[PDB]
Design a protein around this nucleic acid. Structure first.
Ligand SMILES: [Mg+2]
Length: 79
DNA sequence: GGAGTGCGCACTCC
DNA sequence: GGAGTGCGCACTCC
């Protein structure tokens, strides 16, 4: 398990927040949300997002270079 | 003034 | 047909 589970949880909470705002849960929106909720800097959030995707605890969907991240508990439309 | 948020609506996709 | 996605702004906050 590469990501810190505490940070994975905060990122999953960020994904839920951004989804509820009806925006794509992108890297940038996730970083801003986790900065607001806990003061973690952009570099650390980006690292932990990538590690969580490698762990399988966060899902990554890519469309022509643009990424959307999903909670395994609420994966929405996935193929 | 600019960051942040809410959501109606056009578009996607099954 | 319609549920899901997120774009585009009206709106709110400091
Ligand atoms: Mg969970």
């Amino acid at each position: 398990k590469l990501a810190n589970p505490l940070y994975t949880e905060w990122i999953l909470e960020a994904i839920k927040k951004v989804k509820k705002q009806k925006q794509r849960p992108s890297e940038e929106r996730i970083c801003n949300a986790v900065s607001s909720s806990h003061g973690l800097d952009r570099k650390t959030v980006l690292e932990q997002l990538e590690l969580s995707v490698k762990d399988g605890t966060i899902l990554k969907v890519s469309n022509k270079g643009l990424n959307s991240y999903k909670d395994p508990d609420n994966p929405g439309r996935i193929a």
